[PDB]
Every structure is written in structure tokens, then in C-alpha cells.
Design a protein around this ligand. Structure first.
Ligand code: FAD
Ligand code: NAP
Ligand code: FMN
Length: 607
């Protein structure tokens, strides 16, 4: 592991009074942290972002040694209300700890989604725990909602945050504005092709000469063994991929996740270089104008613009308000420069404009640059404002017991008409779809979704659509525990699709698993073969009687995977309704009964 030296001392030697910590998994908490950090400057202060995993939060008790010190926590909730992987140490510390944080000023902005069981469990916990330890709070806990518009929640929070900080402290709004760069463009008018980054994530040339172990910092270029179309119809594109993980010493069980690092669309990369009048084949690097940080570049350098745009940056998701504000200065046409600046707006017509014209219309960077022709920003700066391309996760669709050498992926390619007028393409899926048996930089993330330990326990699997991914592994494995002489309890699947002749995923394989008894019951819900919708819940409601026999008397485990928005919630109320009917109890006590099955490892979600 190896922690970094005391962050308070580091702040002392750099004149920083505020540190902002990020509990990120996909770069959102990290992004917010960075914005708040650089914000401090225009308020008579100097901030600093930081990954908790790299430090000993115990040093928190030292922040008081710095004048007008402040710690902010931008945390995201994940798993069953669990903290993000980098926040684990911290979360764990917060508990065992006895430390006295007297004199510590803090504030917490949490990132969650009401769509889940444990809304901002992590954020709410950090804010609550630090106060117990003795630290004082200088601002109300923030509850951003990804389900609605997380970006806006953060803005209204940030808008109220700083003034309170300013008030509590002597500081105040200093000067007009800023427009300060984090990096310096050092053009390498000529450099050694062997010292140039071509798209690897960690060590230089790590993609070329592979060498275990492999992880998020060191992905394993797995070869694409197969890429099969699963959908019968033409409405959408659902595909099956098999990645060759031989000689990678990678370990995985059914239920785990596989992460992939994709490549943006080149037409979209080139057009950005083209409208910007820039040459993407310029070799360069952007070194931190702060020679005191670890983050020397905002991505592997030296590299070419083309490379950063292709493998290191996000050019398809809607630009955040701060990025747009920073760009406004490049709009020659004043009316256009207005719209841009006014989208960072505190609220009002501007907050209406950004939400509909950019987010709803789902305008990526290039689209903006096209609708505001007077906006031509220098390319080296745009690269500094663009967020990093994140790896995409997929629920490994195979069993290690059976395919220890391969990691399968069941996915639906994203492609749609945006409202922006253009057709959007899903980064990872469009990329995977183009792979023809072909390497995919990947890596596995251990999950909590797991078959039960004793092969005899009954399992109920509810996975509509692609939510069947992990279950293909589960079944593959149980089919194994039977072919292997072991005794297996009932294995039930509640799958759903549109029509059996359109997107019945794994129709054939699933039939074999039924004609062999690996699948006790194969209960499929064809949502569009009749005027009314027939969903999994309905099948569940139908078998209410038997399901209570496996749940209440059989000690069966419940697994739900798929859509979190509705399916998960719907499928849940049904289980409440079931329990509330059999071995009768009030509603309220049926929900507590159910919520108590998820606690005891018998009701697992993965949405
Ligand atoms: C733990 C985990 C497991 C997953 N398992 C699977 C799996 O087994 N199978 C599978 O197919 N996917 C799975 N996903 C989804 C997967 O990670 C990708 O999101 C999906 O493949 C698309 O990625 P993309 O990069 O191609 O799309 P992106 O370019 O990243 O775009 C996706 C975003 O576009 C937006 N969007 C999508 N459609 C529309 C529309 N019509 N209108 C407006 N906005 C839209 C949404 O904000 C969405 O978040 C999983 C995700 C997680 C976190
Ligand atoms: N977190 C994870 O581990 C994980 C794993 C796999 C997938 N996912 C996610 O789940 C989503 C699945 O997309 P998909 O295209 O593959 O599924 P889908 O095709 O959109 O839907 C699958 C089936 O479910 C039905 N359905 C729709 N609303 C429902 C509800 N409220 N209750 C019960 N059934 C409902 C559909 O019927 P109708 O279309 O007719 O309405 C259809 O028959 C993706 O956004 C993906 O990100 C997450
Ligand atoms: C698999 C998954 C699980 C999630 N679990 C939770 C959760 O338990 N609670 C919550 O409030 N939000 C949950 N969210 C919402 C995210 O925490 C929200 O999108 C957050 O902004 C992501 O932050 P990051 O980019 O910093 O990792 C989940 C999102 C995903 C994709």
C-alpha cells in the first residue's frame, strides 16, 4: 500500500488551508473535489484534492495546527451502501478510531441516488461520524442525486458553501474572477518514439510488454475469442463476448465484475481536432504548474492530442458547467460567450438552458463546438478541462469453475437519437461491438454478488434483460455442482425480454440447462407478446406459494440483477406482497422481514 507523508504537513509547506477528499469510483467525486479545491483560490485561500487511500486520515487531528483549516469530503455511496473502494480504509478507520478531532472544521457533499436502498449512506456517515469524533461542521451535509441531476445539486451546494466559509472565516470574495491553468503546454518539437504514450494506463509500454499482476492501473490486454450477436431481431444490438485471460493469473468467481478501458470514436476525435484547427498528431504533455503535486500531468505524457482524445479523455458525455465557463472566454461572438458563461449560473434561465440544451439534448463536446461556432478553444486547454475516460463494468457472464480461462460479457450496445439532433454512440459498447476475432484492456473487480456456500441452498434469480449476465455464470456453475456429483438445491430463473423472436438472450443455452435439470424452473416473461406488459414480478406473484416455501422453509437466497430504476423496486414490492400474505404479517413487517433477508446474505442486489 504505502501511504504518503502527513497531508497536513504537506499543506503547511505549500500554504494550503483547505483539503478536499474524494471517495470516487468513476471520477465524479474526484471531479467535484478538484473544482472545490481550485475554487478556494478566488476566495483568498488555496485548496488541494486528494485520494484518501493514499493518506492516514488520523492526521485529521493535526489540521487545527494550520490557520483557518478546513476539510471537505466529496464521497459517493456504492454496493449495499458501502463506501467507494478507495474510501474503504477511511470508512474502516472512522470506526475503530477513538481520535479527538477537536478544532477540526469540516463539510460533506455526498453523491448518491435515491433509486437505491441506502441513499448516500457513505456521505451521511462521514458527516455524522466526524462530528462524533469532535470536529465542528461549517456547512450542512450535501445530498446530491444522480437520479435527478447530480450536477445541479452540487452547484446549488457549492453556491451556498463558499459564502458560509467566507463568513465563518475572515476571507471574502477576492477580486473579480480567475481563469487559472493547472498545466503548462510543453510542445515536444521532436522526441523519442519510445518515450511516447500510445494509450496505456500505467507504466510506459505496459500495454506492449504485459507482466502480472493486472489491475485498474495495469490492465491486461485480453484477446477477444468470440463476439456473438444474441438478439434474434433487429430492433437493438445485444452481444456476447468472450475474453481470453490465459497467462494473466487473474482470479474471478461468478458474480464478479469485469472492467474495460475503451477507445473513443475516431471520427469524433478527428472532427474535434478539425473544427479546432489543431493538429492532433502533435506530441506533447501538460505538466502541472504546481511542481509540488504528484499529479504531474492530467493523463499519461508525453502523448499526442489524438491519443489523449482517443484513450485518455471523455468527449461524449455532457460537458460540466465549470468546463463550459472556462470555454466562454474563447467565444468571439458575444451572444455565444453569454450563453456559455451563463450556464454556470447560480440558477434561473441559465439553469434551465444548461439542463435542456446540453444535458437533455445530451450534447457532447463536439456538438457544443458546432452549435457555438465562435467558440474555438485552444486544444491544449480543452484537454486540460475534459474529464478522463472511465473504464466500463460488466457482470462477468461465465463461471470460473467452467471457464477459468475466459471472462464472458453480455451487453446491449448503446446508440440513440439524442434531442441534440445527432445520433449518440455508447463508448464502450460501440467499441466492443467493433472487436472482431482484437484485444481488450480489462481487469476484474471482486463483487459481493455470490452463489450460496452450501450447494444445497435454493436460489431464486431475477434478471430481466441483460440483468441475466451474472446468472449465466451462476447456472453454468450449478450445472457444474451437479455434473460434479454434488447435491444441488432448487435453481430458479425469472428472466424477461421483449419477445422470444427479438431479444431472448441465451435462448438455446438456457434451454439445455432446463432439459438437464440445472434450471429447476425457467420462468420467462415476454413483455411484448401481448397487449399488456408481462414482467418478472408477475411471474413471481404467480408462484407466490412455492416461493414462500423456498424462502421461509427452504432458506433460499434471492438474487436480483438488472434495472435499478424500476424492475428492482417493482420486484421488491412483490416479495413484500408475497411475505405479507403467507405466514401473515402487516405490510410494514413484511418489508422489515425482507430487508432482514438482505442483511443475512439472502437477498442480493446488483443493479
Ligand atoms: C456493476 C455494473 C455492471 C454492469 N453490467 C452490465 C451487463 O452485464 N450488460 C450490459 O449491457 N451493461 C452492463 N452495465 C452497463 C455498462 O457498464 C455500460 O454502461 C453500457 O454498456 C454502455 O456503456 P457505453 O460506454 O457504451 O455508453 P456510454 O457512452 O457511457 O453512454 C451511457 C450513458 O448514456 C446515457 N444514455 C443511454 N441511452 C440513452 C438515451 N436513449 N437517451 C439519453 N441518454 C441515454 C446514460 O446517461 C448512460 O449512462 C453495467 C454497469 C455497472 C456499473
Ligand atoms: N448493476 C449491474 O450489475 C447491472 C447488470 C446488468 C444490467 N444492468 C443495467 O440494467 C439495464 C438493462 O437494460 P436492458 O436493455 O438489457 O433491459 P431491457 O431490455 O430494457 O428490459 C428488459 C425486460 O424488462 C422489462 N421491464 C421494463 N420495465 C420493467 C419493470 N419496471 N419491472 C419488470 N420488468 C421491466 C422490459 O419490458 P418492456 O421493454 O416492454 O417494458 C423487458 O422485457 C441497463 O441500463 C444496465 O446498465 C446493471
Ligand atoms: C453499481 C452502482 C451502485 C450504486 N450504489 C449506490 C448506493 O448504494 N447508494 C447511493 O446513494 N448511490 C449509489 N449509486 C449512485 C452513485 O453512487 C452515483 O452515481 C455517484 O455519483 C457515483 O460517484 P463516482 O463517479 O464518484 O464513483 C450507485 C451507482 C452504481 C453504478
Amino acid at each position: 500500500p504505502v501511504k504518503e507523508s502527513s497531508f497536513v504537513e504537506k499543506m503547511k509547506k505549500t500554504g494550503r488551508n483547505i483539503i478536499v477528499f474524494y471517495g470516487s469510483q468513476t471520477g465524479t467525486a474526484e471531479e467535484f473535489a478538484n473544482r472545490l479545491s481550485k475554487d478556494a483560490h478566488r476566495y483568498g485561500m488555496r485548496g488541494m484534492s486528494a485520494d484518501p487511500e493514499e493518506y492516514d486520515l488520523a492526521d485529521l487531528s493535526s489540521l487545527p495546527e494550520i490557520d483557518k483549516s478546513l476539510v471537505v469530503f466529496c464521497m459517493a455511496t456504492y454496493g449495499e451502501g458501502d463506501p467507494t473502494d478507495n474510501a474503504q480504509d477511511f470508512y474502516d478507520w472512522l470506526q475503530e478510531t477513538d481520535v479527538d478531532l477537536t478544532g477540526v472544521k469540516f463539510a460533506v457533499f455526498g453523491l448518491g441516488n435515491k433509486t437505491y436502498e441506502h441513499f448516500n449512506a457513505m456521505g451521511k456517515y462521514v458527516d455524522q461520524r466526524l462530528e462524533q469524533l469532535g470536529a465542528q461542521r461549517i456547512f450542512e451535509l450535501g445530498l446530491g442525486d444522480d437520479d435527478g441531476n447530480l450536477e445541479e445539486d452540487f452547484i446549488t451546494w457549492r453556491e451556498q458553501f463558499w459564502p458560509a466559509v467566507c463568513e465563518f472565516f475572515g476571507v471574502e470574495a477576492t477580486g473579480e474572477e480567475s481563469s487559472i491553468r493547472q498545466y503548462e503546454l510543453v510542445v515536444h518539437e521532436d522526441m523519442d518514439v519510445a518515450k511516447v504514450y500510445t494509450g496505456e494506463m500505467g507504466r510506459l509500454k505496459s500495454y506492449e510488454n504485459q507482466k502480472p499482476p493486472f489491475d485498474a492501473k495495469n490492465p491486461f490486454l485480453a484477446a477477444v475469442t468470440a463476439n456473438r450477436k444474441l438478439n434474434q431481431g433487429t430492433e437493438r444490438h445485444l452481444m456476447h463476448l468472450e475474453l481470453d485471460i490465459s497467462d494473466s493469473k487473474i482470479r474471478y468467481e461468478s458474480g464478479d465484475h469485469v472492467a474495460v478501458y475503451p477507445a473513443n470514436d475516431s471520427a469524433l476525435v478527428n472532427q474535434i481536432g478539425e473544427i479546432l484547427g489543431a493538429d492532433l498528431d502533435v506530441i506533447m504533455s501538460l505538466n502541472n504548474l504546481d511542481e509540488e503535486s504528484n499529479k504531474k500531468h492530467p493523463f499519461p505524457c508525453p502523448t499526442t492530442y489524438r491519443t489523449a482524445l482517443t484513450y485518455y479523455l471523455d468527449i461524449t458525455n455532457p460537458p460540466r458547467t465549470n468546463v463550459l465557463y472556462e470555454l466562454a472566454q474563447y467565444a468571439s461572438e458575444p451572444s455565444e460567450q453569454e450563453h456559455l458563461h451563463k450556464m454556470a449560473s447560480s440558477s434561473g434561465e441559465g439553469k434551465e438552458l444548461y439542463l435542456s440544451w446540453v444535458v437533455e439534448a445530451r450534447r457532447h463536446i463536439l456538438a457544443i463546438l458546432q452549435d457555438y461556432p465562435s467558440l474555438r478553444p485552444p486544444i491544449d486547454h480543452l484537454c486540460e478541462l475534459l474529464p478522463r475516460l472511465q473504464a466500463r463494468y460488466y457482470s462477468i457472464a461465465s463461471s470460473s469453475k467452467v471457464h477459468p480461462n475466459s471472462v464472458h460479457i453480455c451487453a446491449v450496445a448503446v446508440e440513440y437519437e439524442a434531442k441534440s439532433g445527432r445520433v449518440n454512440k455508447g463508448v464502450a459498447t460501440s467499441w466492443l461491438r467493433a472487436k472482431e476475432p482484437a484485444l481488450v484492456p480489462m481487469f476484474v473487480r471482486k463483487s459481493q454478488f455470490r452463489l450460496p456456500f452450501k450447494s444445497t441452498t435454493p436460489v431464486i434469480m431475477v434478471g430481466p434483460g441483460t440483468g441475466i449476465a451474472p446468472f449465466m455464470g451462476f447456472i453454468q456453475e450449478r450445472a457444474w455442482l451437479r455434473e460434479q456429483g454434488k447435491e444441488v438445491g432448487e435453481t430458479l430463473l425469472y428472466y424477461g425480454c421483449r419477445r422470444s423472436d427479438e431479444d431472448y438472450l441465451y435462448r438455446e443455452e438456457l434451454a439445455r440447462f432446463h432439459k438437464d435439470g440445472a434450471l429447476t424452473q425457467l420462468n420467462v416473461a415476454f413483455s411484448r407478446e401481448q397487449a399488456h406488459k408481462v414482467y418478472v414480478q408477475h411471474l413471481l406473484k404467480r408462484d407466490r406459494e412455492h416461493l414462500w416455501k423456498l424462502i421461509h422453509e427452504g432458506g433460499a437466497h434471492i438474487y436480483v440483477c438488472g434495472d435499478a430504476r424500476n424492475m428492482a423496486k417493482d420486484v421488491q414490492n412483490t416479495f413484500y406482497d408475497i411475505v405479507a400474505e403467507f405466514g401473515p404479517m402487516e405490510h410494514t413487517q413484511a418489508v422489515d422481514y425482507v430487508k432482514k433477508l438482505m442483511t443475512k446474505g439472502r437477498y442480493s442486489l446488483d443493479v
